[PDB]
Design a protein around this nucleic acid. Structure first.
Ligand SMILES: [Mg+2]
Ligand SMILES: [Mg+2]
Ligand SMILES: [Mg+2]
Ligand SMILES: [Mg+2]
Ligand SMILES: [Mg+2]
Ligand SMILES: [Mg+2]
Ligand SMILES: [Mg+2]
Ligand SMILES: [Mg+2]
Ligand SMILES: [Mg+2]
Ligand SMILES: [Mg+2]
Ligand SMILES: [Mg+2]
Ligand SMILES: [Mg+2]
Ligand SMILES: [Mg+2]
Ligand SMILES: [Mg+2]
Ligand SMILES: [Mg+2]
Ligand SMILES: [Mg+2]
Ligand SMILES: [Mg+2]
Ligand SMILES: [Mg+2]
Ligand SMILES: [Mg+2]
Ligand SMILES: [Mg+2]
Ligand SMILES: [Mg+2]
Ligand SMILES: [Zn+2]
Ligand SMILES: [Zn+2]
Lengths: 177, 38, 162, 97, 38, 261
RNA sequence: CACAAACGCGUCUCAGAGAUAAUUAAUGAUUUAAUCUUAACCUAAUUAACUCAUAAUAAAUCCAGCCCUAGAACAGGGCACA
RNA sequence: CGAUGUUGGAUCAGGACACCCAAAUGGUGCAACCGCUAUUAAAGGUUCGUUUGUUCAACGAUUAAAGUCCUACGUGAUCUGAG
């Protein structure tokens, strides 16, 4: 508790770097927590006029997952401003083109709509796979828990667990598969 | 203003809508489905 | 489980049925009076698309559903299980239940988009260009309404459209 | 029996069915017999004979079909279903002939 | 093909199939019986 | 390195001389542009990963200029090279098997007759131009009572939109800007003076510098295999080229004087 | 066409790959037959858009004067041969 | 109503698709050539004249075609003024 004034204040308002794994996660749920950490709403010292907001590093963005048919239905529209410059693109296409786009747009959508949005977007770092500049790796304080529990496929289960789950019904020996 | 009776189905005052939504029929739901019973 | 074998020898072809061993229903069910296979294990309103260990028990090695009179499911639960299996396939679970085709594994396509809880088939769905405003809004289906009776531990009903 | 008539059985020489009536497993082979013996398939070609071999002791039901490709198709119905025999028969004896 | 709001079989040979998220009526005998639900 | 199928050569920087007629054995008349290569050297080499991540980049210099009127930085650049300063400098994308060594001369023989090239330059500057010359709008009629309107663009937008769209064609600067002619056949090469005879017209004013390369048009893609490739080296062969190289369809300055039969 | 130019009525040049909708097919379950499948898996045949290869641009800081096929001004190219 | 200047042209066109042309298809009382229908597709096109102030409309000659509309019946601080 006993610090000099300067180092005390420096410690309190310190920036922190969080790591967030995106594999098999919905871009929305990712963007929710990314948003909170970006605005610095996780800090009890929070205020809108204090610069406090933290770096967020999201990785494996390419492997993002989308509930339901959203890959097909959801469209991202933009306009170049020139007549006939209106462009609608299915999320699948956008993602195929630019791996980072989806999650970035989501986060950009969930920040408050003032000017600071442009700044706290500068503290966001998005990597399609896990390849990160060692520079940015050396800043990471901690890794946030992934917001969706990823179900294992059928081949992921140990034979113990497979034999531990009951055969529910008994097939006739005559029947062919 | 529209006549009491009309062709086009006549949007209700919001409170009446609430009233309608509250009073909907609720079918009795058996504790166990009679089919999965013996 | 009965395999059918075919052999070609010297312009004579032999086709014959051969019986293998079938695993049996686990010894002691919780609700033995219970009629339908799901229900005597107390699985009603519990299994989801996510539970593979349950789902793989009704299907064919090539991935399709097993017929109802063979399995013995209550009609309703059959439909539910079918939905779940479709969803599970689409979700990239049960990778071993596809048909094997030596040629087609080689020609890569854009890496499979990870998805889950998908009600329709990917090829059949038009992109919704027009969205629409707050009052008339086009909502995107998620999961299936056949499952809307699953037990909710949160207490809030599952959200079937966004 | 209808799917055999559409398929022009005239490519066949001789069809015999050997089965053992008092066995529990012979229903399939019998169904096959009555599907081939029907008037449509029987009248598609008159150059083909259909023989029913009936024995008590043989204990193994069987179906043997020769055709003019110099081909001999022998399917032993034991655990085989009727329409599996008929589908096999169709794709085998039509695509070749 | 005719796009229709109501599909109905016009003969015994029509069959009724769900493709591309729609319902269809295909007929092999009379192609004129083809129908696509709108 | 030998020639691989998907490979691409260096280009040149030439000087547009003028235009000349030339005839083909079928009797037709073509007009050609004379491009003279004056002093052409490769200047530096940027590797594949350092530039586009796809192809390497060679930098090529144009004709020699005075030392005195350039900048200290640039003068240093050429100092460490050992060339005199070049007027114009351009960048060429090059497959990594085609790379040359900075400080190497390039000549006109680098292109062989019959081939197709692409020529890039600043077009003739026509300055600030009206809407008719710049865009090609009709004007309004001259005589039937039009007042002070004979050239003006007319309506520039819709009433409802209440703004004018970003694309809108309006009076403005015309011509000093870079364009590329594609699919130009090369007919003749003069090896003594280093002159390329190209087909048709090449954007730029005469006596301006110009950037030549092999045609990137799809039809001509693989034409490179028959060409002197890394580039042409008057040293290595130890056998002189003829004064001029021609395409086989070209009537030469002396010849039978064609007779049909 | 009475400036060395501008200009047409004159001359030159103009393109690959992927992607799809409707609609056709192949394999095949729920519904051990069938069935192009808002069943899976691989699949083929297929409009226009639209993306994208590719091309263009791409040397930080001498600049008084003078010249210019560069230019409203400001900028820009030349000024060692000869 | 202490002024939101009005028809048709000119100029430049922005958009819809309920497609006139170009592309891909289904059905035919589709043999072929023509057609008649229906689906999908809006990047690009959609003529010149005689008379009418005219929009329509008639007529001559053509076109791959001479689309239906919205934009203050687009556009008068850009023009016209025949009405
Ligand atoms: Mg009233
Ligand atoms: Mg000029
Ligand atoms: Mg004029
Ligand atoms: Mg006047
Ligand atoms: Mg006046
Ligand atoms: Mg005047
Ligand atoms: Mg506005
Ligand atoms: Mg089948
Ligand atoms: Mg078929
Ligand atoms: Mg590009
Ligand atoms: Mg200068
Ligand atoms: Mg008024
Ligand atoms: Mg006023
Ligand atoms: Mg227009
Ligand atoms: Mg349409
Ligand atoms: Mg057409
Ligand atoms: Mg148009
Ligand atoms: Mg009106
Ligand atoms: Mg008006
Ligand atoms: Mg007016
Ligand atoms: Mg006005
Ligand atoms: Zn039950
Ligand atoms: Zn019919």
């Amino acid at each position: 508790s006993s610090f000099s004034k300067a180092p005390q204040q420096w410690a309190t308002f310190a920036r922190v770097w969080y790591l967030l794994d995106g594999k098999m996660q919905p871009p929305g749920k990712l963007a929710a927590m990314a948003s909170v950490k970006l605005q610095g709403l996780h800090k009890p010292v929070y205020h809108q006029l204090s610069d406090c907001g933290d770096h967020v590093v999201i990785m494996n963005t390419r492997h993002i997952a989308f509930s339901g048919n959203k890959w097909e239905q959801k469209v991202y529209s933009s306009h170049t401003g020139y007549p006939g410059g209106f462009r609608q693109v299915t999320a699948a296409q956008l993602h195929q083109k630019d791996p980072v786009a989806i999650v970035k747009l989501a986060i950009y959508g969930m920040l408050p709509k003032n000017l600071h949005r442009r700044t706290m977007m500068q503290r966001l770092h998005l990597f399609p796979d896990e390849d990160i500049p060692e520079d940015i790796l050396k800043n990471l304080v901690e890794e946030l828990p992934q917001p969706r529990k990823v179900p294992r496929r059928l081949d992921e289960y140990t034979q113990e667990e497979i034999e531990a789950f009951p055969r529910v019904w008994s097939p006739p020996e005559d029947y062919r598969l | 203003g529209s006549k009491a009776v009309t062709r086009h189905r006549r949007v209700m005052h919001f409170e009446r809508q609430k009233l309608m939504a509250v009073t909907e029929y609720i079918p009795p739901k058996p504790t166990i489905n009679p089919r999965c019973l013996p | 489980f009965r395999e059918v074998v075919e052999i070609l020898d010297g312009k004579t072809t032999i086709i014959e049925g051969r019986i293998t061993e079938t695993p049996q229903e686990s010894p002691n069910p919780p609700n033995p009076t219970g009629q339908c296979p799901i229900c005597r294990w107390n699985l009603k309103h519990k299994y989801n698309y996510e539970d593979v260990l349950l789902l793989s028990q009704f299907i064919r090695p090539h991935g399709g559903m097993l017929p109802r009179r063979i399995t013995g499911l209550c009609q309703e639960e059959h439909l539910k299980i079918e939905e779940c299996v479709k969803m599970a396939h689409r979700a990239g679970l049960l990778p071993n239940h596809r048909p094997k085709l030596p040629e087609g594994f080689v020609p890569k396509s854009k890496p499979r988009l990870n998805r889950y809880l998908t009600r329709w088939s990917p090829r059949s769905v038009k992109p919704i260009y027009n969205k629409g405003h707050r009052w008339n809004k086009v909502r995107m289906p998620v999961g299936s309404p056949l499952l809307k009776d699953n037990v909710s531990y949160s207490g809030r009903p599952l959200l079937l459209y966004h | 029996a209808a799917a055999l008539a559409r398929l022009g059985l005239r490519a066949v020489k001789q069809v015999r069915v050997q089965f053992c009536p008092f066995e529990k497993n012979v229903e399939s082979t019998r169904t096959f017999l009555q599907a081939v013996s029907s008037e449509k398939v029987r009248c598609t070609n008159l150059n083909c004979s259909v023989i029913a071999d009936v024995r008590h002791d043989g204990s193994e039901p069987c179906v043997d079909v020769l055709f003019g490709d110099g081909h001999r198709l022998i399917m032993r119905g034991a655990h085989l279903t009727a329409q599996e025999m008929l589908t096999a028969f169709a794709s085998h004896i039509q695509a070749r002939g | 093909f005719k796009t229709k709001g109501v599909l109905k079989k016009r003969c015994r040979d029509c069959y009724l199939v769900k493709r591309r998220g729609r319902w269809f009526i295909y007929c092999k005998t009379n192609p004129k019986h083809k129908q696509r639900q709108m | 390195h030998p020639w691989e199928p998907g490979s691409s050569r260096v280009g040149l920087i030439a000087l547009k001389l003028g235009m000349m007629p030339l005839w083909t054995k079928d009797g037709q008349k073509h007009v050609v542009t004379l491009l003279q290569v004056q002093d052409c050297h490769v200047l530096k080499y940027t590797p594949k990963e350092n530039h586009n991540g796809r192809m390497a980049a060679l930098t090529v210099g144009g004709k020699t200029v005075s030392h005195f009127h350039k900048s200290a930085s640039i003068l240093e650049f050429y100092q460490e090279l050992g060339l005199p300063p070049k007027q114009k400098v351009k960048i060429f994308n090059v497959t990594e098997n085609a790379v040359i060594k900075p400080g190497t001369p390039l000549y006109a023989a680098h292109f062989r007759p019959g081939q197709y090239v692409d020529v890039t330059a600043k077009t003739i500057g026509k300055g600030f131009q009206g809407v008719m010359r710049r865009w090609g709008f009709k004007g309004q009629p001259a005589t039937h009572g039009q007042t002070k309107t004979h050239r003006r663009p007319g309506a520039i937008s819709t009433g409802d939109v209440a703004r004018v769209w970003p694309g809108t064609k309006m009076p403005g600067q015309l011509g000093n800007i870079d364009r590329t002619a594609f699919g130009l056949k090369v007919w003749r090469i003069n090896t003594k003076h280093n002159i390329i005879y190209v087909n048709g017209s090449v954007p730029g004013h005469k006596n301006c510098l110009v950037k030549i390369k092999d045609s990137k048009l799809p039809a001509y893609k693989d034409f490179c295999k028959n060409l002197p490739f890394p580039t042409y080296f008057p040293d290595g062969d130890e056998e002189a080229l003829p004064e001029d190289l021609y395409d086989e369809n070209v009537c030469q300055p002396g010849a039978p004087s064609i007779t049909f039969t």
